[PDB]
Amino acid sequence: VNKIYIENHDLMSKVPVIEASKESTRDDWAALTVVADLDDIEGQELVYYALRFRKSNDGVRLDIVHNPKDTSRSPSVLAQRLKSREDKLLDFTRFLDLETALETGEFEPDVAYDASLANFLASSNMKAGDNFVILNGRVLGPITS
Ligand SMILES: CCCCCCCCCCCCOCCOCCOCCOCCOCCCCCOCCOCCO
């Protein structure tokens, strides 16, 4: 059950995270990962829905894995842009706010991060560009077009 979470600590340590509230209960806890291609509106839309879900459900730990189909730009670039605005993620009220968060910010590519992402996909039998979620170890998707 756990294996997806054990084999990918390096990746999962670097992605944007909204932790479960401290004041939330153990029974309200859930672990939701959204894996989506943030180069495209459909992937962005899925993350936006997940942000809205977390805003209203504060026992949820949400983390976000940018999973582009095209890797000409390092997958770590949008990841770092979003990571740099982690404290703002629950202040978003508008889809445009997420778009804006992804649009600018100069970051060196993280070569090790990119390799950890490729490894995560391979070992999870998913493809670059696929949009999916992991809920308490259950992988659901891909969610097609
Ligand atoms: C096409 C797909 C579109 C996707 C939309 C955007 C993606 C985000 C949406 C994903 C949401 C999926 O999950 C929804 C369910 O979660 C709702 C929030 O609730 C989380 C809580 O879940 C807890 C699960 O329950 C397990 C706890 C069991 C506890 C048992 O307690 C008994 C103890 O009692 C005796 C003790 O004295």
Author numbering: 672 to 816
Give the exact sentences the study uses for this entry:
UGGT acts as the gatekeeper in this system because this enzyme is capable of sensing the folding states of glycoproteins as potential substrates. UGGT only transfers monoglucose residues to incompletely folded glycoproteins. UGGT is a large enzyme, comprising approximately 1500 amino acid residues, which has been putatively divided into two regions: an N-terminal folding-sensor region, which accounts for approximately 80% of the enzyme and is not homologous with any known structures, and a C-terminal catalytic domain, which accounts for the remaining 20% of the enzyme and belongs to the glycosyltransferase 8 family. On the other hand, the folding-sensor region of UGGT was found to harbour three tandem Trx-like domains: Trx1 (residues 168–379), Trx2 (residues 467–624) and Trx3 (residues 671–831).
On the other hand, Form 2 of the Trx3 domain of UGGT cocrystallized with a detergent ANAPOE C12E8 belonged to space group C2221 and diffracted up to 1.70-Å resolution. In the crystal structure, one molecule was contained per asymmetric unit. The final model of Form 2 had an Rwork of 20.1% and Rfree of 24.6%. The C-terminal α6 helix, which is followed by a putatively flexible linker region in UGGT, was completely disordered in the crystal structure of Form 2, suggesting the instability of this helix (left). Because of the absence of the α6 helix, an extensive hydrophobic patch was exposed on the surface of the Trx3 domain (centre). The detergent ANAPOE C12E8 was accommodated on this exposed hydrophobic patch. Most of these hydrophobic residues were involved in the interaction with the detergent in Form 2. Thus, the C-terminal α6 helix and detergent molecule occupy the common hydrophobic surface of the Trx3 domain. Although we cannot exclude the possibility that the hydrophobic patch of the Trx3 domain is covered by other domain(s) in intact UGGT, the flexible properties of the C-terminal helix of Trx3 may contribute to regulatory mechanisms underlying the folding-sensing function of this domain. Thus, our crystallographic study provides an atomic view of the potential substrate-binding site of UGGT.
